[PDB]
């Protein structure tokens, strides 16, 4: 073992406090405390009945095309009522559009590591590139789960988190798979966050960071109780607010419908040319 796990195993250090992920192979050699921050692995990406119909329906929109005049008193009253209903319908439609546009919301994305492109991106004509950093829990987990994905990732292996961020920003990389907490912090502190994480990190291990003590060390119980005490008193939320925040914590369907409606109307008009 090398690194913090190596230091803890070989009795050079009593415990490690750094951003150390909990998994099975490390738990076989060291004793982990309770997780104090939940970190899975996540993905970062870049940002007259027969003729009255036309008269009535044209009287709906007040187009003012003189055709004829009604004769029935009941007909006249119902015509006035229906035209007024058309007017108030227009008013309510305008109000609804104003309320719609003054309303604002945002979009997101979910997908998953098992998506078809992530499995084999050769289907996409330009093969989109994703990669990890080695010497990590994420790389080990990906190697254990899908060897083929790791073999493809080997062609885009890289060293640093900031290097991954700049590669994504400049277009040299498409998706960065990495620890969830680090990616969340980077998304929070990115200027305008052109980079966004795919939902919340919950797909893979979704373990937490822990204090890796020596195997059988007497400090385990006290450390676990102290961490749970901090969780219960809200000090954990205070530390998270102190250290982990960030900035980011015209129609298609309707236009297609309108285009289809007008095209259908024109087509039916052309078909009715003969009769």
């Amino acid at each position: 073992w090398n690194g913090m796990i190596g230091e803890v195993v070989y009795q050079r250090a009593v415990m490690a406090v750094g951003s150390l992920t909990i998994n099975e192979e490390r738990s076989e050699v060291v004793d982990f405390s309770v997780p104090f921050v939940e970190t899975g692995i996540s993905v970062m990406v870049s940002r007259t009945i027969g003729k009255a119909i036309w008269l009535l329906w044209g009287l709906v929109f007040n187009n003012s095309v003189p055709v004829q005049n009604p004769k029935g008193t009941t007909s006249k009253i119902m015509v006035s009522v229906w035209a007024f209903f058309a007017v108030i319908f227009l008013a309510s439609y305008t109000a609804n559009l104003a309320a719609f546009m003054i309303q604002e919301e945002f979009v997101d994305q979910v997908t998953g590591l098992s998506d078809k492109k992530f499995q084999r991106p050769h289907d996409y004509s330009p093969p989109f590139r994703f990669g990890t950093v080695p010497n990590g829990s994420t790389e080990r987990n990906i190697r254990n789960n899908y060897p083929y994905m790791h073999q493809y990732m080997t062609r885009f292996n890289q060293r640093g988190v900031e290097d991954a961020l700049v590669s994504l920003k400049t277009g040299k990389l498409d998706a960065f798979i990495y620890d969830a907490a680090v990616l969340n912090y980077k998304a929070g502190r990115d200027e305008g966050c052109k980079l966004v994480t795919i939902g919340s990190g919950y797909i893979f291990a979704t373990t937490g960071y822990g204090i890796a003590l020596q195997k059988g060390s007497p400090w385990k119980r006290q450390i676990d109780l102290a961490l749970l005490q901090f969780v219960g008193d809200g000090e954990m939320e205070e530390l998270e607010t102190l250290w982990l925040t960030g900035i980011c914590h015209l129609d298609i369907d309707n236009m297609a419908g309108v285009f289809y409606m007008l095209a259908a109307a024109m087509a039916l008009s052309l078909i009715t040319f003969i009769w």
Partner: peptide
């Protein structure tokens, strides 16, 4: 007639969207 109706409706909805914007 029907062409007039559809054109009137489309221009009407366009002006409604314009007023709303």
């Amino acid at each position: 007639r029907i062409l007039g109706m559809v054109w009137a409706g489309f221009a009407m909805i366009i002006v409604a969207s314009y007023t709303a914007n």
